[PDB]
Amino acid sequence: TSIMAVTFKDGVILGADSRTTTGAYIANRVTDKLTRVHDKIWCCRSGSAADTQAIADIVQYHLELYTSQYGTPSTETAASVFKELCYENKDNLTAGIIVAGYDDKNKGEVYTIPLGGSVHKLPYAIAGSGSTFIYGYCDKNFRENMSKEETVDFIKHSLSQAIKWDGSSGGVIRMVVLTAAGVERLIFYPDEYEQL
Amino acid sequence: TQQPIVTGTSVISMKYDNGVIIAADNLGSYGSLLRFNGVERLIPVGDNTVVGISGDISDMQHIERLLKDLVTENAYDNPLADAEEALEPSYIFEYLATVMYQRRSKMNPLWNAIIVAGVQSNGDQFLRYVNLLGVTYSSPTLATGFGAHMANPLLRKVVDRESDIPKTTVQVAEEAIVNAMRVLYYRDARSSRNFSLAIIDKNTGLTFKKNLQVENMKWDFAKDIKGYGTQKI
Amino acid sequence: QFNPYGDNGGTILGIAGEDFAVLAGDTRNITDYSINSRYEPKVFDCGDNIVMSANGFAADGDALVKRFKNSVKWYHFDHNDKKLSINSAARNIQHLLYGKRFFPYYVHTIIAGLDEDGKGAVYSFDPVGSYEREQCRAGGAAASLIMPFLDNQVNFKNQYEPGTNGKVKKPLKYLSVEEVIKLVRDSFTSATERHIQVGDGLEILIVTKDGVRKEFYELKRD
Amino acid sequence: SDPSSINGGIVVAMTGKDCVAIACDLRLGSQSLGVSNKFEKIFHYGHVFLGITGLATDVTTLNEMFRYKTNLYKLKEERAIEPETFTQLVSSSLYERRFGPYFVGPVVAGINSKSGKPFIAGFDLIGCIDEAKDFIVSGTASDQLFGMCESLYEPNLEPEDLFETISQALLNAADRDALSGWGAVVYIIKKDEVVKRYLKMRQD
Amino acid sequence: TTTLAFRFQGGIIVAVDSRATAGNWVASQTVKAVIEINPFLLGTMAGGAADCQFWETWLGSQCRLHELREKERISVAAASKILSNLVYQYKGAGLSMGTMICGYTRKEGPTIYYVDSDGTRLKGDIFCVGSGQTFAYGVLDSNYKWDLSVEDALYLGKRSILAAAHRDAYSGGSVNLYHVTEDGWIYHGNHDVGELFWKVKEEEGSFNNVIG
Amino acid sequence: GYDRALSIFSPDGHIFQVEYALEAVKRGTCAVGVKGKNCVVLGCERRSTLKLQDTRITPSKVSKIDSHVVLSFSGLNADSRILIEKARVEAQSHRLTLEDPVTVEYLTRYVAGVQQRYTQSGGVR
Amino acid sequence: TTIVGVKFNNGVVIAADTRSTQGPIVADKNCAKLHRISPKIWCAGAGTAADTEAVTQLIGSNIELHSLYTSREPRVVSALQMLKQHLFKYQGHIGAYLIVAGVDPTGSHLFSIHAHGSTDVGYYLSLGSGSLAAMAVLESHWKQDLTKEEAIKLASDAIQAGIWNDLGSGSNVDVCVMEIGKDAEYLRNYLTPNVREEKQKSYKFPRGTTAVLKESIVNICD
Amino acid sequence: MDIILGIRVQDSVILASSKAVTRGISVLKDSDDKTRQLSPHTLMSFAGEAGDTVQFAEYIQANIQLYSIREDYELSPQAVSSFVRQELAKSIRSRRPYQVNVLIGGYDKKKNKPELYQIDYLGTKVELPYGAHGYSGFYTFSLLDHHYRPDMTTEEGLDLLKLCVQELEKRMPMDFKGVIVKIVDKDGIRQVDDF
Amino acid sequence: MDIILGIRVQDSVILASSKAVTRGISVLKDSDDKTRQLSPHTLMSFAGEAGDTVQFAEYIQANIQLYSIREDYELSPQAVSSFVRQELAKSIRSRRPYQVNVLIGGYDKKKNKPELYQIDYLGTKVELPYGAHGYSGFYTFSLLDHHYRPDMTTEEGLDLLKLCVQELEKRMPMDFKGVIVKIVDKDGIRQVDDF
Numbered sequence A: 001t002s003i004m005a006v007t008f009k010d011g012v013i014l015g016a017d018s019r020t021t022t023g024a025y026i027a028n029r030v031t032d033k034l035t036r037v038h039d040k041i042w043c044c045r046s047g048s049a050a051d052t053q054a055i056a057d058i059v060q061y062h063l064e065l066y067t068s069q070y071g072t073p074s075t076e077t078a079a080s081v082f083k084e085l086c087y088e089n090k091d092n093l094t095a096g097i098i099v100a101g102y103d104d105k106n107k108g109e110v111y112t113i114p115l116g117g118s119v120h121k122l123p124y125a126i127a128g129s130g131s132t133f134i135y136g137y138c139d140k141n142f143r144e145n146m147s148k149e150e151t152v153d154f155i156k157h158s159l160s161q162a163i164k165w166d167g168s169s170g171g172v173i174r175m176v177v178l179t180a181a182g183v184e185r186l187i188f189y190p191d192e193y194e195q196l
Numbered sequence B: 001t002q003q004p005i006v007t008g009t010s011v012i013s014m015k016y017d018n019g020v021i022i023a024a025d026n027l028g029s030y031g032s033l034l035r036f037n038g039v040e041r042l043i044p045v046g047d048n049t050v051v052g053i054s055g056d057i058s059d060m061q062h063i064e065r066l067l068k069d070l071v072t073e074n075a076y077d078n079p080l081a082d083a084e085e086a087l088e089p090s091y092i093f094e095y096l097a098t099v100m101y102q103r104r105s106k107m108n109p110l111w112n113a114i115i116v117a118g119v120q121s122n123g124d125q126f127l128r129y130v131n132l133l134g135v136t137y138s139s140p141t142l143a144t145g146f147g148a149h150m151a152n153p154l155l156r157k158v159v160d161r162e163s164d165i166p167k168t169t170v171q172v173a174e175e176a177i178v179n180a181m182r183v184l185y186y187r188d189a190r191s192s193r194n195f196s197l198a199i200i201d202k203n204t205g206l207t208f209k210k211n212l213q214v215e216n217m218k219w220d221f222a223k224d225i226k227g228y229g230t231q232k233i
Numbered sequence C: 001q002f003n004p005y006g007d008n009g010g011t012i013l014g015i016a017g018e019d020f021a022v023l024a025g026d027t028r029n030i031t032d033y034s035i036n037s038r039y040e041p042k043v044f045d046c047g048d049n050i051v052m053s054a055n056g057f058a059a060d061g062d063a064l065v066k067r068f069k070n071s072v073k074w075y076h077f078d079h080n081d082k083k084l085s086i087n088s089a090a091r092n093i094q095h096l097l098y099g100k101r102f103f104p105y106y107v108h109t110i111i112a113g114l115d116e117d118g119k120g121a122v123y124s125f126d127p128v129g130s131y132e133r134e135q136c137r138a139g140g141a142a143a144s145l146i147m148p149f150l151d152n153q154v155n156f157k158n159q160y161e162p163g164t165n166g167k168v169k170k171p172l173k174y175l176s177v178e179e180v181i182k183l184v185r186d187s188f189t190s191a192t193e194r195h196i197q198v199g200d201g202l203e204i205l206i207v208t209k210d211g212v213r214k215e216f217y218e219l220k221r222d
Numbered sequence D: 001s002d003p004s005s006i007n008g009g010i011v012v013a014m015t016g017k018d019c020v021a022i023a024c025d026l027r028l029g030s031q032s033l034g035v036s037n038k039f040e041k042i043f044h045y046g047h048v049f050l051g052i053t054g055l056a057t058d059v060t061t062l063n064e065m066f067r068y069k070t071n072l073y074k075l076k077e078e079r080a081i082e083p084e085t086f087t088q089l090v091s092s093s094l095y096e097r098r099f100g101p102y103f104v105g106p107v108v109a110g111i112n113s114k115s116g117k118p119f120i121a122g123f124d125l126i127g128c129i130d131e132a133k134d135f136i137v138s139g140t141a142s143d144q145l146f147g148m149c150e151s152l153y154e155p156n157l158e159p160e161d162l163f164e165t166i167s168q169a170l171l172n173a174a175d176r177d178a179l180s181g182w183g184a185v186v187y188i189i190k191k192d193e194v195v196k197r198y199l200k201m202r203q204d
Numbered sequence E: 001t002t003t004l005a006f007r008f009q010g011g012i013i014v015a016v017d018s019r020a021t022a023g024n025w026v027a028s029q030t031v032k033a034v035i036e037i038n039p040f041l042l043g044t045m046a047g048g049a050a051d052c053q054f055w056e057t058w059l060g061s062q063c064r065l066h067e068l069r070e071k072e073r074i075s076v077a078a079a080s081k082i083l084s085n086l087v088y089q090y091k092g093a094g095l096s097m098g099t100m101i102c103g104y105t106r107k108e109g110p111t112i113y114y115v116d117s118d119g120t121r122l123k124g125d126i127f128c129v130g131s132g133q134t135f136a137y138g139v140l141d142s143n144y145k146w147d148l149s150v151e152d153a154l155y156l157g158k159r160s161i162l163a164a165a166h167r168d169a170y171s172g173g174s175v176n177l178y179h180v181t182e183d184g185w186i187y188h189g190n191h192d193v194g195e196l197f198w199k200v201k202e203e204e205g206s207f208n209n210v211i212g
Numbered sequence F: 001g002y003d004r005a006l007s008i009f010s011p012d013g014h015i016f017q018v019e020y021a022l023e024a025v026k027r028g029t030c031a032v033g034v035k036g037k038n039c040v041v042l043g044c045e046r047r048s049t050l051k052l053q054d055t056r057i058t059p060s061k062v063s064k065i066d067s068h069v070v071l072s073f074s075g076l077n078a079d080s081r082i083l084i085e086k087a088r089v090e091a092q093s094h095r096l097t098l099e100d101p102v103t104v105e106y107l108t109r110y111v112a113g114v115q116q117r118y119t120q121s122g123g124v125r
Numbered sequence G: 001t002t003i004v005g006v007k008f009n010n011g012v013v014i015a016a017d018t019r020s021t022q023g024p025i026v027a028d029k030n031c032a033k034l035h036r037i038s039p040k041i042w043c044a045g046a047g048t049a050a051d052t053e054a055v056t057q058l059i060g061s062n063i064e065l066h067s068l069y070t071s072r073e074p075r076v077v078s079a080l081q082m083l084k085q086h087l088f089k090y091q092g093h094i095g096a097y098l099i100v101a102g103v104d105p106t107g108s109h110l111f112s113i114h115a116h117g118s119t120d121v122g123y124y125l126s127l128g129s130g131s132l133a134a135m136a137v138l139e140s141h142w143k144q145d146l147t148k149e150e151a152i153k154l155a156s157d158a159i160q161a162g163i164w165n166d167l168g169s170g171s172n173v174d175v176c177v178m179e180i181g182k183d184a185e186y187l188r189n190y191l192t193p194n195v196r197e198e199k200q201k202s203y204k205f206p207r208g209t210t211a212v213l214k215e216s217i218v219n220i221c222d
Numbered sequence H, I: 001m002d003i004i005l006g007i008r009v010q011d012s013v014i015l016a017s018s019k020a021v022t023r024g025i026s027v028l029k030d031s032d033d034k035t036r037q038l039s040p041h042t043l044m045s046f047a048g049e050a051g052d053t054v055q056f057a058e059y060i061q062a063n064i065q066l067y068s069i070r071e072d073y074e075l076s077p078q079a080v081s082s083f084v085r086q087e088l089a090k091s092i093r094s095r096r097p098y099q100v101n102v103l104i105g106g107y108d109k110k111k112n113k114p115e116l117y118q119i120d121y122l123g124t125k126v127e128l129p130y131g132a133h134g135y136s137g138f139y140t141f142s143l144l145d146h147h148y149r150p151d152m153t154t155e156e157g158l159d160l161l162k163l164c165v166q167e168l169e170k171r172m173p174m175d176f177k178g179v180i181v182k183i184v185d186k187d188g189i190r191q192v193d194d195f
């Protein structure tokens, strides 16, 4: 996997590749690693496909039950539920999750949750095997309060390089845009991003 | 006792009515890292043979040097080096097959899988495989690594047995090879889009094609796929 | 760690008649769950009316056959073109195999031909050189399936004369080349049904005083 | 220390014209040592026959267990259990011990009393059903039995002919296995008569 | 395997079975476990088939070279020691052999030497080697006397192999008998255990545990 | 290693080095062997130009090769010690492998074989 | 095993081969790998044979009870969710690899489930040892907007690729078509391209061949 | 624990069990009785892991004695053997199994027949004319195959048994310090003091 | 191979060595002589790994006999023991060491004294009044500490030796089939036939 989430002026954008592997065989070349846990709280999944799915399903259940009682949860609250599961079951899980959401008060927020189950709130986050190859690029090119189009280009160029160097990453580049306007899904095919 | 470091993935090939086709991508992987992108894994020997190599690249470069030296050695005191006493595909293969088996028998193998494709002096098609263990076999279609699992099934739909070879044209055969390379790009995590392809014909001779790309890919249906089960958005 | 051995599958079968002998083997070559070739012969005419097959790890099998063929060649040079008898060939092969006792050829070897009285002969070897002459022998992946069938149909084991209260055994007798090929074909079609490494094709080499003849038959390709 | 090949033994079952046959060897050993030549591996509950190969303690245990269950079945249902139903009971019971299984290779054989149809089935140690028209094999000489049965068998054999085919399949397979043999028994099963024959075989 | 050889009034009896196995798979029922080193020396074979076959054939070549050089037959002691000294050089390499070198000479009389792959060399009157050795020992020990007739001795050796063939799963097939005298060895036939068992059961009244 | 062929044929078909070795034997003190009906006796000459000798410690002319075989000689004394040593070693080696002491013929054949080897080996006389 | 699933215009089709293995041995030459969870929800299973049957029957049982409780036709996502949560709980120890497909009031669906509890969505999927051979065909010939007859052809062609090229797969091709508004049609042995050829000889024995020691009538009655 | 034998003859069952108890390089005792009376006409010998053997034997003994008191009736050897087998069959899949092999020699008073059952630690039961556990069988079975007849007397059985012990004393590596022999018949259980 | 003992008394050295040769669960021989005469007044007993024992003993025997012929003179027990120790000392650092333990009993004709040397497979030499190899020592040493006196006769030594064998036969787990006893004194080497 190569995944990332980036905050910007109007909110936050999640990005991911579409490759699922079993050794060197690509079990799924059109995977959707960007998953909804609430209307405007989504997550990027890396690590075990089984573990991350089971976790995301439980979180979605918790946040649905939260909403029934206490109304819309914060992105911090969602990240806390993810953490609780990842930390307390750290011995049996292989999950690297990035939580991203849009509040009206707090705007765009990004929380990353590595293997140990620690939580880290950041302006932007990168994760997955392919992230290693773009630490240098992303650090040099990221700016706060970018526009939607700039953020889309930043994610596109970044994941393009991650995909280029990482054999465990590839396929299409999926993106999910979270703003006050709503939820927008984006897709970008090889013929476009490869020749960037 | 070795472990391969910089590696090359599948090599695929097949026979057709007048000759043989062989192909392999231009990638030199370093584990999961797709490190080197300008690697040529098809190596011509003379104007009638092409050796396709997968596996360890350092050992591939060693084999290149052996084949290059073989051509030099054959020319020594040989007035018919470019005629009757030129190197045949069968000669080149048997040499490599001898080396591979000797190296495995010394517990120090050349960590490769090799396919020697060519046309003999009498016009007969030559296509034979050899690997790090010294194991050899021949078939109308041959492939290494993932190609064995994914390409062979596709190529065998064209040439399922010996009698299908005269019925298969170079246009049909090349089409199948190029299609197979696309499928490997879809499904092999250590493959690249860029590849080389070689045709050895008994009439038109050796045609070596570089810098080919996988094209006419299907990705559009991906936009319709959402979530992993229930998710609607 | 590097493993110098491999399993190329396949199975072979040698039957001896009165004035002939057959050595059959399927033409399928495999690694793990993949097919490498649907027609890769592993039964060879080695000269002097000797046919040979070394089944198991193909690289070791090819090396052995190659060395024995070369042994036959030098036997002619060193001994005034004398014909290498099947028994002399067997003993020579023992020394080839045992010469690598501490790094063996992973093959079951079988040879067939005629003895010095003109009668059919089959010899079978273990990987390190122990050999024995037999009327009947199956080797390879499906040997466990085929061999007890041969015991029953070739050597008439467990078969008693009807009405004799299981006191009189069914009498041993030589089979015709026609009856033997029937058993070979039925042996391999049965093995093909129940063993995944067996199929594609069947190549039989028949040996008489006249020479070495070949016969080929299709097998199921699944 | 492989539970399925400590005691040794084999079972085979075949179908014929309006009949079924099931057969087994009589050996029970402890690896190389032969201990008993009277250890029958075929049992019956009403008209349903069950053969069991593998670890002998589990063979005995399962016989006692299916006798237990079929006796209660009959008391509640007021009728004898049929082969198709029994087959499912065996599968259920084995899978109940999925992560601590009985090391066995059972084989069901019988004729449905209502439809008159011949029925045989085989299982793995965790209960996977292997239904078949022709034959089922089980034991330490299963490879040998597969080879004999696949070549000797033909459909619609009469009881008297079927007896010869199954007996020869068992005998010649048992003689190529060290851990099987030491006697044999064959059950020929017709709609309303059952014949049991002990075979003469080599005792080595 | 089961092989035995014992010394008695009338020379030496050698008896072996004919089974060979690869795990539980019975590879052969017709193996020659007695190897004829020469017209006067016999060697039994147990353990590795190839190791025994190869080196005891080699032994016969060395014994032939001895009598060419010395113009005299090789002693059983000298023949057994050539084999034992050879396998001792290969100790640790993984040879598997349990053999009995049996012979009759003037100076020695009837002599048996147990020779094994870990270097052991023992002279003795009675030896049983193989996976079924214990079963054969039981019958042999309880019925053995020095003053056995040649007829009774041949039967005892045959009966002891049968005992092992019956109980030991990895023993059976047939029984090969040999009688060794000063003038050489005499082969006393191949005896299928299938027919031999029932014959012995009926005539002797033994094996009541078996249904006949 | 010194390789020179010292023992070689001459035009008349003689190997002079072997024949000159016989002259050295002819120079040596006389030695005689006589065998009776139940015994053998080995007699040996000792030259009397050497007085003030210590006969306790002086090497004896007759040497035991084993407890049942003896060896006397004529010729170069230093050379004899080498043959005697080799013979004694072979005597023990024979007992070890054949489990029986050497015959007199066998021991002789061995010693004679050693002597012959030195007539067509390079670098030796 | 080779199993596949292909979506089309008005529904979904799944297919499977019919070989069951026990190591290198073919245990069942015609086993059914297509399972019914509910009338219009079917499942193709690969991996541990007992696990795929047991888990498909358990979820099928609970789906029936759920359908009765809710007075509604069962949905594929319910079977999917129930299966994956069961498989996840056992951490891969239940070796069931499934392709789940069907039609329900929501529409037509196609999923795959792996032993550890991960699910995938697709228009075409393949699982089992012959999945690579099958996927090669699917990647070569699949397109959007397939008809019923085109999807059956593509599915069976993908299974055939596994039958011929994968040693783990063989024998026949089973198919199940689940179309919207129609009853699901289970096509057992849709293709039978591996029929055993006539044997060369009949091995029917003369009566009395087998030696017998004892006979006795067995009492099956009360 | 090592050698236990059993021979069923015409009118009785004879059990022979070694007297040695060895731990390390020391024979701690040479007069150990490796048997327990389960009921007046049923005797069980045992061999296996230290501690487990006696603990198991006495546990079975207690259960059979409890049954006898409750019903005022003696269980048949067949019934006792089945009870014992089931206990071992349970045991083998426990957290820590009983590593004990047993022979059960009994006289059925209803049938007027002697009965010998051999049960190993896995719960593998067989009725036999003669039986053994451990390495003993590798010598005795072939010997008994030859010399055993079904119609033998108790005295003939004891001579047959002496023949087994002699063979074991000749060919066994370990010194097992002889055997305690006990006879089970219609009149109950008694010990042979001079063997 | 297992039990070898040695006792030096006033005028002689007595060696006792077990007769059993065991392989697996079978006693292959019960009359094995685990000793070789190195010279007329020097005897060596041995025990250890199969094959190595005899091969080593005979190799030493050949070397000492060669020396005797060459010099027409018998080496002293001290000299022979030192030669043997050095061979084992070389061996222990070889590719495949001799796993053989020996006792060397000899009578020195120049000193007119008996001498007993104990040498293990490492090349560890000690001169002792009494010695043993293997598990035998664990019983015999304490017994000899109590009963042994330096001025004992050969007959007293044999009775002392009988006391050791009896204790071994009582407490040792394995049956070693008795011992062959040999005496070394001024008149050379002789075997006690009735022990």
Ligand SMILES: *[C@@](C)(CO)[C@](*)(O)[C@H](CC(C)C)NC(=O)[C@H](Cc1ccccc1)NC(=O)[C@H](CC(C)C)NC(=O)[C@H](CCc1ccccc1)NC(=O)CN1CCOCC1
Binding pocket: A001, A002, A019, A020, A021, A022, A023, A027, A031, A033, A045, A046, A047, A048, A049, A050, A051, A052, A094, A128, A129, A130, A168, A169, G114, G116, G118
């Ligand atoms: C990139 C690839 C790596 O960072 C991404 O993180 C993606 C995440 C997406 C899918 C959300 N990761 C994967 O694709 C993931 C890679 C992986 C593998 C093993 C452990 C962790 C991560 N792949 C999987 O989870 C596959 C998905 C299946 C094919 C649908 N599952 C496997 O590879 C299973 C995993 C078993 C497992 C191991 C350890 C922890 C949890 C689960 N492994 C196998 O099936 C083993 N396989 C058997 C056949 O022989 C080859 C090995």
Ligand SMILES: *[C@@](C)(CO)[C@](*)(O)[C@H](CC(C)C)NC(=O)[C@H](Cc1ccccc1)NC(=O)[C@H](CC(C)C)NC(=O)[C@H](CCc1ccccc1)NC(=O)CN1CCOCC1
Binding pocket: C055, C056, C104, C106, C107, C108, C126, C127, C128, C130, C140, E001, E002, E019, E020, E021, E022, E027, E028, E031, E032, E033, E045, E046, E047, E048, E049, E050, E052, E096, E130, E131, E170, E171
């Ligand atoms: C009784 C019968 C059992 O011990 C006897 O001891 C007999 C004596 C007769 C055979 C002379 N012994 C055997 O039968 C002996 C058992 C044995 C095997 C291996 C080591 C020690 C003892 N059997 C063999 O040696 C068989 C003889 C064959 C069946 C003719 N051979 C094998 O098992 C061979 C080679 C084994 C081996 C020995 C040493 C180094 C390497 C290998 N193995 C195979 O044939 C396996 N298979 C052959 C087909 O190709 C794939 C490998």
Ligand SMILES: *[C@@](C)(CO)[C@](*)(O)[C@H](CC(C)C)NC(=O)[C@H](Cc1ccccc1)NC(=O)[C@H](CC(C)C)NC(=O)[C@H](CCc1ccccc1)NC(=O)CN1CCOCC1
Binding pocket: D004, D054, D103, D104, D105, D123, D124, D125, D126, D128, D129, D130, G001, G002, G019, G020, G021, G022, G023, G027, G028, G031, G033, G045, G046, G047, G048, G049, G050, G052, G095, G128, G129, G168, G169
């Ligand atoms: C293709 C053919 C292979 O990939 C398919 O995937 C099919 C699936 C269909 C049948 C639903 N798979 C098999 O046929 C499968 C392959 C396999 C084997 C072993 C482990 C995993 C997968 N075969 C089986 O499941 C057979 C079914 C038999 C023929 C009825 N079962 C076995 O081979 C069992 C394995 C049981 C098992 C237990 C615990 C964990 C995993 C598997 N093995 C045995 O029965 C062998 N043995 C017999 C002697 O007694 C001891 C057990």
Ligand SMILES: [Cl-]
Binding pocket: A020, A031, A032, A033, A049, A053, B228, G119
């Ligand atoms: Cl996923």
Ligand SMILES: [Mg+2]
Binding pocket: C221, C222, G162, G163, G164, G165, G166, G167, G168, G169, G170
């Ligand atoms: Mg196939």
Ligand SMILES: [Mg+2]
Binding pocket: D203, D204, E164, E165, E166, E167, E168, E169, E170, E171, E172
């Ligand atoms: Mg047997």
